[PDB]
Amino acid sequence: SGRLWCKAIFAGYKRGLRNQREHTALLKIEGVYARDETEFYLGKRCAYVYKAKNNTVTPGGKPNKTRVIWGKVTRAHGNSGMVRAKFRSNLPAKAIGHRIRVMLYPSRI
Amino acid sequence: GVDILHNKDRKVWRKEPKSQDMYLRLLVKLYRFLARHTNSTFNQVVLKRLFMSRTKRPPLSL
Amino acid sequence: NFAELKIKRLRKKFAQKMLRKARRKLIYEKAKHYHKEYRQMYRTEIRMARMARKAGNFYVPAEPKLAFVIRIRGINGVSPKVRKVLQLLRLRQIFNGTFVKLNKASINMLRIVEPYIAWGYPNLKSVNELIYKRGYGKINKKRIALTDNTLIARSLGKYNIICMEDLIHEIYTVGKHFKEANNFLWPFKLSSPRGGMKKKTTHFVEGGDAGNREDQINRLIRRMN
Amino acid sequence: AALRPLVKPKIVKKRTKKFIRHQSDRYVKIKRNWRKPRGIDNRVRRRFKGQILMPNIGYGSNKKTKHMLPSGFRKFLVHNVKELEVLLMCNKSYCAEIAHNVSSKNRKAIVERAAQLAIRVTNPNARL
Amino acid sequence: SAHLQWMVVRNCSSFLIKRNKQTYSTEPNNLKARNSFRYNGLIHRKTVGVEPAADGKGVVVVMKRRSGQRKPATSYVRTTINKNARATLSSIRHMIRKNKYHPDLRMAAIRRASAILRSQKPVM
Amino acid sequence: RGLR
Amino acid sequence: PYAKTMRRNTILRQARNHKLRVERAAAALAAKSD
Amino acid sequence: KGKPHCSRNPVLVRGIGRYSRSAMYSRKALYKRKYAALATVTKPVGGGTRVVKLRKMPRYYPTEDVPRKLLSHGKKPFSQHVRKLRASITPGTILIILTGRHRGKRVVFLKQLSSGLLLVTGPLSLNRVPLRRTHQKFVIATSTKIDISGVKIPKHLTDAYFKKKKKYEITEQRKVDQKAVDSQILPKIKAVPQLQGYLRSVFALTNGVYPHKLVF
RNA sequence: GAGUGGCGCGGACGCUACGCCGCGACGAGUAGGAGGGCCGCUGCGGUGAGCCUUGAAGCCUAGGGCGCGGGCCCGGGUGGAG
RNA sequence: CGCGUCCCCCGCGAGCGCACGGGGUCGGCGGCGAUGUCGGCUACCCACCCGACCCGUCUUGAAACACGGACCAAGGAGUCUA
């Protein structure tokens, strides 16, 4: 019926300037623009949903092309509502500036 | 970063004889046991000396 | 016929149990007496200060007996005289901490390394969390964690330091056996200060972190511990 | 109905890639077989950022899972049926492996015996 | 003695087989089949062997006798046990414990006998 | 003996 | 081992002081009503 | 011989009892409570008789077994765990089941079951959600609570009643149990105006609606 | 610690002692030194009732793997005598 | 917190059970599965982000506008005696 996930942009990796740590990603969740607002999103499940050539099995359905890398929002990055997330596979740099879905599925409210 | 000098951290004494002779190497097994198990410091000195080179254990005259 | 062995081996088992309880009660009552002492020490420094103010005089409190010296600068490019003193203070690594008793011989060893250390006059609570959280005993030349009192009773018991509280009392209230109880402690492996340093290079007085922070080491111990 | 090992822990590996030799990519005369660079100016030798890694002892695999195959067994290499009875007591820990230069007819004997003795073989269907 | 002729055999015996970071002994009376002081089956005065039968069915238990130990042809006294599993394993337990015969090979012999009885059982 |  | 006794005493004292504080605030509310 | 009294020291904080061991010695009255100091079953046989062996020694030992492991203490099974609720999930509250086939649906909470899973019946009439379990973590608790306090939820519909037995076909029991609870809640969600329409409708994130912003 | 006195036939694992186990601290590196290699090449004495025309060596390999590495073992192809 | 005994001030009780107690367990579950699907980390190709100058050498200092090296195979340098 409706959207049950919040719009996050994979802005880039946790990096220095001349070193990047690919294991941690830096999400930009739409609406939250301060460390105050990002208290809600800590521990939330987040998916990089993409689609590839070959039909992979879909749990609760027949094989679609759409795939996921399941992540978790770990903590607040920086001062301005950015958030660190850590994925079961280090995200591809294909997805820098593309949509990942921070879900409300690990609710605390 | 710890300011240690590793120059002398390895102690350069014998743990065992350099020899492959079995009769000595059985006497070492016997005094490996007696040294560490008995409270006697004698057995520690005998074990220590079974390791040592031909030149370090020179012949004692009658 | 074993009935005597069975009974005798159970009496020995029991004699050590009642002996534990008696030591366990001593350790309990020693700590209860120490709570009474720290009250009286803290309360008298107020009492003395007050009657001096009532008179219109001043109460200059005792120059402190006990410092907690943390190393704040690293291992690279250090003068030989500074190297030597820092390893006599057992500060061989950045953010290592040791308790140092103040006298004339010690304070001239803490001005010779002033740029490289941050020290002060630690609180009672600073001595607690350091000895409990970070407290590792040097037992048979091995850094072994103070997880039971009998680690402290086996090394230091000949100086009548038979529990964690006896060690804390001997450090804070710099006792006759401060040297042995302090050398028993391994230098405290403290983490980097959470919220940051102000400025490593310069002295605390000129907006830095190096040198003497009298009351103010306790702000940074709680930050680093 | 494959043979299970006694215990199947997590074979954790600190690196899965090969330590390829410095400038083995550039030249065909240079093999991939690792050689420590001992050049005075060698970027790889003196650990510049973003260069080829040098194999340390640090990458050493956990001793409990070292030489352990993905199946949880370790290889023991077997030339004939007389070297199987070696393994009939180290059965749940070690798997047999028939050597390349063992004949077709002699594998048929080893594989069939190993099934009797409940010994796992890594290459049981290797001539036929 | 045993401890001496271990120091000869430990590395350079014909039965010794080193490969794949493993060490084995193909000696005719070693139960755990491994290069070990305890398990070596030529070196001790008392030795327990467990082999399959001359037939297909049962286990032979090789006791080495106390007396003629320079006398190979009479030194090993073999007894075939062709019974149910539980009683084959019981007989071996009684032989070793209740004769006191090398009683620290008591369990290795049973585990071996058990694995021989498993072997000569028809496959599903 | 006191707890007898 | 004495830490348990010290903690119990601390918690009890804190609870008693909080009850006294609530009573004083009630007295203050009554004074404001007066 | 003695019925167990319940612990005389009330729990002040977890681990620490309110009364000292001198006050407790007094409270237990240990000043007048002081005190001084199989296998073989012979069955007859129809010979003589036999002595049969209970738990006979095993017929197969493997080539190697694993050693018995060390003993921890705080590692109970799931049957013996303590079950948390939030302050927000109280009986009567309307939840938003987030994750299921019933995702985004506004659904009435009944009771915390004895597996930590919530019992939830967004009336089958409105939501098309039955007598069903949900997980707390996979549910938003809304600040919209009906007065459910008067209902009689049956004992027999417990954790073992909603456990997947293994085609799924609805038992005539599960239809009776539905309606018996469905009939007690439906007149209480109609006592609040515009509420049944809310339960029929499904939760969505539309443009500008950021879950952190909306307190509810 | 010891001497004279007032029913059921049972119990994991181990200890190549050149082995196995435990606890602590530590780990840049040219020239250079030392050690250990179940790293590799070729020949000799022993040894494996080894392997091999039902296919040795060599070679190729988008195959399965092992070792920190030197390297190695398996699969498949080629080959024909070690 | 029995008391048999000692005087200044006036040597072993039995049970049970809970656990902030010497390093994780569940006596909790749920999906999927034969011609399109699962796993396969490594290896083949490709893409993207970050890093990333060419080795050997003499040198205080080499990516150097220092020298040697187009490419490949095979050979090729601390030996033996005293």
User: Could you tell me where the DSSP H helices lie in chain E?
Assistant: 2-9, 72-75, 85-97, 106-119
Residue H112 sits at φ, ψ, to 5 deg, of -65, 115
Nearest to A105 by CA among H138, C197, B36: H138
- DSSP run (H or E) holding C36: helix C3-55
Kindly give, in sequence order, each residue whose CB lies less than 8 Å from that of residue A35, ignoring residues fewer than 6 positions away.
A76, A78, A79, A80, A81
The reply to whether D106 has its C-beta less than 7 Å from any atom of strand I is: yes
Partner E contacted by H58 (CB < 8 A): yes
Q: Do C32 and G2 touch (CB under 8 A)?
A: yes
Q: What angle do CA G11, G13, G18 make, to 5 degrees?
A: 95
Nearest to E41 by CA among E8, E11, E6, E70: E6
How far is Cα C22 from Cα C16, in angstroms, rounded to an integer? Answer: 10
Residue D94 C-alpha, separation from nearest chain E C-alpha, in angstroms: 10
The reply to whether H63 has its C-beta less than 7 Å from any atom of strand I is: no
Residue E122 tokens, joined: 């028809």
CA separation, residue H203 to residues A4, A7, H103, H186, H196 (Å): 8, 16, 8, 21, 14
Nearest to H189 by CA among H90, H92, H52, H58: H92
Question: Does residue C112 contact residue C207 with C-beta atoms inside 8 Å?
Answer: no
Nearest to C117 by CA among C138, C155, C141, C88: C88
Residue D53 tokens, joined: 């890694």
The reply to whether A18 has its C-beta less than 7 Å from any atom of strand J is: yes
**Cα within 13 Å of Cα(C166), Cβ side:** 25
How far is Cα E38 from Cα E46, in angstroms, rounded to an integer? Answer: 11
How far is Cα A64 from Cα H210, in angstroms, rounded to an integer? Answer: 29
E76-81 and E59-64 strand pairing? antiparallel
Residue pointed to by tokens 């294909």? A94
In the structure, do chain H and chain E come into contact, i.e. share 3 or more CB pairs under 8 Å?
A: yes
User: Could you tell me where the DSSP H helices lie in H64-209?
Assistant: 172-189, 195-200
Question: Does residue C120 contact residue C213 with C-beta atoms inside 8 Å?
Answer: yes
Residue H114 tokens, joined: 């004895």
CA H142 to chain centre: 22
Partner B contacted by E73 (CB < 8 A): no
Residue H10 sits at φ, ψ, to 5 deg, of -70, 150
- CB-CB neighbors (< 8 A) of B4 in chain C: 92
Q: How many CB pairs under 8 A join B and C?
A: 16
Sign of CA dihedral H22, H23, H28, H34: positive
Q: What resolution, expressed in A, was reported for this entry?
A: 3.1
Q: Name H residues 159-188 whose Cβ lies under 7 Å from strand I.
A: none
PDB experimental method = cryo-EM
Question: Does residue H213 contact residue H154 with C-beta atoms inside 8 Å?
Answer: no
Q: Name H residues 34-73 whose Cβ lies under 7 Å from strand J.
A: 34-37, 69-73
Burial of residue H87 (CB within 10 Å: 0-12, 13-18, 19+) is exposed
User: Coil, helix or strand for C13?
Assistant: helix
Partner E contacted by D86 (CB < 8 A): yes
Enumerate neighbours of G (3 or more CB pairs within 8 A): C, H
Residue A75 sits at φ, ψ, to 5 deg, of -165, 170
Residue pointed to by tokens 């061991």? H21
Residue D101 sits at φ, ψ, to 5 deg, of -90, 10
How far is Cα A103 from Cα A108, in angstroms, rounded to an integer? Answer: 12
